[PDB]
Amino acid sequence: MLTFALTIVRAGETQYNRDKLLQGQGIDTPLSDTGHQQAAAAGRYLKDLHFTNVFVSNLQRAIQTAEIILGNNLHSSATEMILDPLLRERGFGVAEGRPKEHLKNMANAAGQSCRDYTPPGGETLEQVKTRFKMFLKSLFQRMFEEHGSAQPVIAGLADDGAQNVPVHALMVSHGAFIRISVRHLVEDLQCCLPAGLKMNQVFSPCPNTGISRFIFTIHREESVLRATRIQGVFINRKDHL
């Protein structure tokens, strides 16, 4: 109707990951050398895939990660890299630039758990979730426009779940945004899970340039595009590291 693969990759490391500082949207700096190497390893890993569509956070570390992946790709040089602010990392407001532990301290000082707490000038979970839902609606519209009309095999390889799926989007984003996105796919939209992936495993944090994959089936429910099936394939893969 339209079936398409979505590969999701977290940005590479900046200078600030090493120090375990909260980056969010307000720390917008380039990849470290490690970051470059992570992105290059991810690019070699995915080099045999044709990405028909590429969507990227407009934060620099995400842009560069995507550039390096595409620069390593054997098939996707004609693909325009779409910059989408909807893919930006969760904003952590005044907490940005502080070590990650400080966020815990602020939460505790406000009598709230970390899941409940939003620092001044940051986004709530609901706000980020809203950005992913908007991205998704926009994703479905763009994918059906270019590609639409009226069980995954998991071998431990770069093309798992997508060996014979020609329509393939790449999404390059950030750790907290990706975590929230996966949660929406898994919890809200109740996507199928493969091979021993369950609730417990699916919610682990994605490492820098960690790679996840879902297969979407979509159609027109009389003028409204909806997913008739979302199939998880793999989450947070880092073999290339």
Side-chain angles (χ1 to χ4, degrees):
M1 335 195 197
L2 179 69
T3 297
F4 72 88
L6 180 64
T7 291
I8 309 171
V9 180
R10 181 185 175 202
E13 204 156 302
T14 66
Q15 315 287 349
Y16 301 112
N17 300 71
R18 153 189 71 248
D19 313 357
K20 308 172 170 154
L21 302 182
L22 208 58
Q23 288 187 72
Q25 299 189 25
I27 316 290
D28 192 12
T29 58
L31 293 180
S32 61
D33 188 68
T34 301
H36 273 85
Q37 294 180 281
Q38 288 167 342
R44 294 187 298 277
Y45 189 69
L46 302 164
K47 80 189 196 307
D48 294 304
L49 289 165
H50 177 227
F51 301 115
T52 54
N53 302 80
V54 173
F55 308 94
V56 190
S57 164
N58 70 337
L59 290 163
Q60 182 178 34
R61 62 205 188 263
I63 299 175
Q64 285 180 291
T65 300
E67 285 176 338
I68 291 158
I69 288 165
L70 291 177
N72 270 279
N73 195 267
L74 299 174
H75 307 277
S76 308
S77 63
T79 302
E80 189 195 342
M81 171 183 312
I82 306 300
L83 298 194
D84 193 339
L86 294 170
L87 293 170
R88 289 165 77 81
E89 182 60 302
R90 177 169 190 192
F92 293 93
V94 301
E96 290 182 346
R98 301 291 298 128
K100 297 186 198 292
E101 290 202 340
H102 172 66
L103 186 66
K104 270 84 163 96
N105 291 353
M106 301 183 69
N108 293 349
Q112 282 188 298
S113 75
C114 287
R115 271 176 57 248
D116 284 1
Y117 179 78
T118 300
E123 303 171 88
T124 67
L125 279 176
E126 208 52 37
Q127 291 180 305
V128 183
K129 204 188 287 187
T130 293
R131 292 201 281 111
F132 183 58
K133 295 176 210 178
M134 294 171 71
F135 176 72
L136 217 42
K137 195 172 262 83
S138 168
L139 175 64
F140 291 177
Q141 178 58 44
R142 162 74 59 65
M143 298 308 284
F144 201 87
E145 270 177 50
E146 319 196 338
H147 307 286
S149 53
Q151 197 68 19
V153 173
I154 301 170
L157 296 174
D159 63 351
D160 287 349
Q163 299 90 345
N164 287 99
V165 177
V167 181
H168 201 143
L170 173 62
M171 175 190 313
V172 181
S173 186
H174 304 277
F177 187 89
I178 285 164
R179 184 92 88 123
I180 292 158
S181 293
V182 164
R183 192 173 281 270
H184 177 66
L185 292 184
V186 167
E187 293 189 342
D188 299 335
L189 305 190
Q190 298 186 270
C191 70
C192 307
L193 298 165
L197 267 175
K198 270 171 166 128
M199 295 310 269
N200 167 260
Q201 304 70 44
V202 301
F203 300 123
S204 50
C206 186
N208 288 101
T209 71
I211 310 166
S212 300
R213 179 165 304 148
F214 296 82
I215 309 310
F216 288 83
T217 304
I218 67 171
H219 83 325
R220 286 212 174 263
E221 183 99 28
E222 100 222 289
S223 141
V224 45
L225 287 169
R226 80 163 77 234
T228 56
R229 184 207 204 105
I230 304 169
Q231 173 78 60
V233 181
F234 58 81
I235 296 293
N236 306 330
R237 193 176 277 184
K238 60 156 180 52
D239 299 342
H240 61 288
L241 292 187

